[PDB]
Design a protein around this nucleic acid. Structure first.
Ligand SMILES: C[C@@H]1CCO[C@H]2Cn3cc(C(=O)NCc4ccc(F)cc4F)c(=O)c(O)c3C(=O)N12
Ligand SMILES: C[C@@H]1CCO[C@H]2Cn3cc(C(=O)NCc4ccc(F)cc4F)c(=O)c(O)c3C(=O)N12
Ligand SMILES: [Mg+2]
Ligand SMILES: [Mg+2]
Ligand SMILES: [Mg+2]
Ligand SMILES: [Mg+2]
Lengths: 262, 56, 270, 270, 47, 264, 56, 49
DNA sequence: AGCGTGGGCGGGAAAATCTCTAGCA
DNA sequence: ACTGCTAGAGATTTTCCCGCCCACGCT
DNA sequence: AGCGTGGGCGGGAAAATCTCTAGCA
DNA sequence: ACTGCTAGAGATTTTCCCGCCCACGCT
């Protein structure tokens, strides 16, 4: 656990973030997040939030296909809708919220997507919504070309099924799996689970550190009763707790430490 | 090589663990609780990595 | 054998006696009493007391149709995690269930289905669809609802939740969607405290991240183990080492996932 | 009141979350989590898990009607022994049940009956007959077959044995009499290898031996214990000595069956 | 003074709250508003 | 304990008290009491041919309605049954009732038309019942059967105003004779003596049941101050350090290490 | 006046024993398993004598 | 080489005997006379001989 | 150095208990 | 004021026995 | 004899597990 | 060739904490 000092030179020189110094120096993640928090130059904004989802419409063969996009992984699905009304979109958005943790819905302000039903369902859900604004404008053409590629997949597999929506399900299955490539030749699942798992990791470390920042450490040093503190606890160790008073990383014995309860 | 496996044995209504994995194929997985070599078939396996490992 | 043994024979003929009664009244060893209870074929007992094991591999997915308010509800559950989806069906016909399964496989890494012998799950349409998607179809013991007990308990659970949240929404499918969302994200506890959404993420992510890890390891690592086991002095091998122990290593010789102590083994570089 | 606590309140209003859910998502102590689970009166749960106690005193007798092949069979069982008597009834009418009960009391020391709330066991003829014989009546929970289930288990046993010996006799009630005879005398095991016929001898014989020995020994033995309790130097008494212990006697002072040590006690001759 | 909720038997729903009157080790007698009913401990719950 | 044997032997010599008295008084095992009551000369009474299943059977037709009355004569218990028609099937049914509740071993009846059908023979063959016809086991209680039936008729004469129907009053009356006719040496009602006789019968037949397996067995024995293996003696009581046996006629105790038990 | 009492305790449907009886009334029974002096209600009691007591 | 008897599904009466074909840890396939059937262990019982 | 006996040991029978389940409408 | 319970099947633990054989007493 | 710390203890909160049950038609 | 199981409630054990106080370490 002696990597605490050589993580600091790494984020000073190369400024690699908390994951690299967490995995390399084999540390607890909180000390990596606090060293990259000590970066006076490098920092990352949030809203990043990987719950980004794009909505898009089409009306193919006189039948409505509503297309959702996980923008963070490039995952896309779509569903067949009989009539263009707000209740159908409320049902579909509750479907997406039920399976995946949707928090960001980018769409337009069209008549087919602006009823009060989806507003009531979104108040029941609690989702930040976007209307015409790209979170970042790179994938805006990627969404369009991906929908065109899905129409090409429909043009392939309409002989693979009799009904429309059966071929639609076959096509979204195929784009979930049979379209590969990237750095690993991966399926869409093998990227979307890597997208969603690190989100759970980051929010779990966030909620882990929410409780500790209320708490304080009053500690004394070795060979002296100088009761210093209140330091911030980072990693409560088995014999050596990890704290910091002002800027010094401190491994301190538990007998030499003392914990304020709130 | 540092993961955790929940498992159970036959004729028992409770799940046990966490053992550490030692080797995996597909059909049979070997795991290790304290010193055992549990040759658990895949139909009884439970292979995870709990996110409370940040203290461990 | 004795005259008392033949009288026990007559007593089992007339009354179907217990083994302990015949062993008492004629001073019999218990084995012949057990045989005479086993003798008369009208004296047949109530079977064994041990439940079977429902298979827990991540590639399996349970489905069942259930009924509520006169409507048929299709529920599917990942067996390893209890990630649940449920929906209303128009009619209990196999084509709509095949569409349901195609949605399931299109959204999830589904390999094996495991249902009962209901009428909807026995069409030719689900056979054509599972052959189209390459699904391992499997059915249960023909009238035993125990092998489906996970998804039957989850049918209990979601209907209990529907009992809580039927009031907020008007129609059935609305509150059904609300309920399945509540269970798949908000219901916390169980294995690691998580809801089943985080649990199935853990399952499939650790599945891929471990199997590609061992696939990368086994193409680099290759060591061949001879071994002289106990009760014999021959040095049998070579074997593929699965993992090196500290006092006993684990190998596979030809088919057996076995453990040999290191003093009884011999690891060759190639 | 933290902001996330009222947010957890709105969360349970929308979803009825777990206590562990609000404990995780808002870093809450579990007491307020259990409070907010207890808050929503639509969040009401499956209740408590412990089985009650069916009485085991020799004066009580279970009775119920059961039904088989369109015929109503009245079965009574002594609780502490499992001695069984059963008959075909003409019709499910309380006068015939009173006749069966009077046969029961005329053949057996029956003090208290214990049935469900069936129609036959609620007629005024049964109450007149049990007041004539001086029987204490008692009925159970109006929809719980559990407290009255020790007899239903014997009904299962009885119809199982009827399945064994229905082929021997032509008529139904003939084979029924054969079956109840087989169970009362031939089926051995249970507590000490006994059939129930000698067990009901054993229970009643110990009852009409022990309390008469006790009555003839309490008229002779009469010793009065003044005892100093713990945390108290006062010598309280007198108490009726039940039995002299080796380091602690047992007494009853006013209503309390106390195990008081002999150093803390004082046994006066009268 | 304890609130009680209960499942009436031969039913799947639940009712309550109500007032205990006399607790027993298998079943408790209860006033709901004027309903004096005794109920098993496997089909109820005391707060 | 092991020196109470001779002082029980002199009691059976001078006074000839049976095995129950010497068993309970001297706090002995029952098997040495049975062997001492067996070893007497004039204390060897007759066999069984005692019976607790002494059941007299008698029909009557009161008010032109059939009442079959059975008596447990061995301890004076009586019951009865209201019967619609005079046939053998009714008697077979009631005799199977009595055999089902109580261990009916012996039945004493007449050779009348009512009690002598082949269905009764099939029933008692299915139960295994010794049957008598007109013969008393002892002719003492033969008048007691008649006076008990007349006493029950007097009880009916009391309590026919206690019921409306015939058989209801019959059940009330047999209840009353089961309890409301006290007396004897200890004021017992009616069933306390009969459950005493049934309990004692069960105890002595289970002790016979205990000893009938031991008589196959042998125990080759030696003694202290002797490696000689004499015998094979007969085992009385399997002990913890000292075992009671008999070689020829002496009731001895022998250390367990000095024993060798043939298991057949 | 040593006797045999089979009995159970609350919340457990397994009967235990055989204790010796030490005192009996009408509602409360004092029994003794090995060294405990247990007080058992009358509706939980089982009071017997073995016929195989004649070995002990 | 053992007989088996079985409780049929949704029924209280028992039948048999049948010859074992493949024993499983929850359920066994067997042949009665021409009935190749599988049956759970809680709903059946093998004879020791 | 033969010869004669004993003590624990294991193999096994078997005996007591524990655990667990169908099922009662 | 009331209240799940009970017969059977392996499964497992415990315990005589036996024979025996290796350890130890007699000519 | 004042004064200044220490160690376990108990009282209690609270946290992990046992276990056990309704219920899925 | 196949296979009961899963969420919740006390109940019970177990484990930090704290305060405290009695037991000890210094002016
Ligand atoms: C017409 C009376 C009026 C009152 O209510 C009904 C309904 N009832 C139902 C069952 C029953 O379900 N037995 C199976 C069982 C299931 C579980 C358990 F723990 C115990 C069990 F015995 C009976 O046995 C029974 O006698 C009656 C009855 O008599 N009545
Ligand atoms: C028409 C198909 C054809 C095959 O047979 C029927 C009958 N059946 C019966 C139950 C049932 O008894 N559920 C309660 C339950 C009881 C005990 C247990 F261990 C598990 C449990 F779920 C079902 O759930 C179910 O789905 C069916 C079904 O689908 N079918
Ligand atoms: Mg089903
Ligand atoms: Mg179902
Ligand atoms: Mg009933
Ligand atoms: Mg019933």
């Amino acid at each position: 656990l002696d990597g605490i000092d050589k993580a600091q030179e790494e984020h000073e020189k190369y400024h690699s973030n908390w994951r690299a110094m967490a995995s390399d120096f084999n540390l607890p993640p909180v000390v990596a997040k606090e060293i990259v928090a000590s970066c006076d130059k490098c920092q990352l904004k949030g809203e990043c939030s990987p719950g980004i989802w794009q909505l898009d419409c089409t009306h193919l063969e006189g039948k409505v296909i509503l297309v959702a996009v996980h923008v963070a992984s490039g995952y896309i699905e779509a569903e067949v809708i009989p009539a263009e009304t707000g209740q159908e979109t409320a049902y579909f958005l509750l479907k997406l919220a039920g399976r995946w943790p949707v928090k960001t819905v980018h769409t337009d302000n069209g008549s087919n997507f602006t009823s009060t039903t989806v507003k009531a369902a979104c108040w029941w859900a609690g989702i930040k919504q976007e209307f015409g604004i790209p979170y970042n404008p790179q994938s805006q053409g990627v969404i369009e070309s991906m929908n065109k590629e899905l129409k090409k997949i429909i043009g392939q597999v309409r002989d693979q099924a009799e009904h429309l929506k059966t071929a639609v399900q076959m096509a979204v299955f195929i784009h979930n799996f049979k379209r590969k490539g990237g750095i690993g030749g991966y399926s869409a699942g093998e990227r979307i689970v890597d997208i969603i798992a690190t989100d759970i990791q980051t929010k779990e470390l966030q909620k882990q550190i929410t409780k500790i920042q209320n708490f304080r450490v009053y500690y004394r040093d070795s060979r002296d009763p100088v009761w210093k503190g209140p330091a911030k606890l980072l990693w409560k160790g088995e014999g050596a707790v990890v704290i910091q008073d002002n800027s010094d990383i401190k491994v301190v014995p538990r007998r030499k430490a003392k914990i304020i309860r709130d | 090589q540092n993961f955790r496996v929940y498992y159970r044995d036959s004729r028992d209504p409770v799940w046990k663990g966490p053992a550490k994995l030692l080797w995996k194929g597909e059909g049979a997985v070997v795991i290790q609780d304290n010193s055992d070599i549990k040759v658990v078939p895949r139909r009884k396996a439970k292979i995870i990595r709990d996110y409370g490992k940040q203290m461990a």
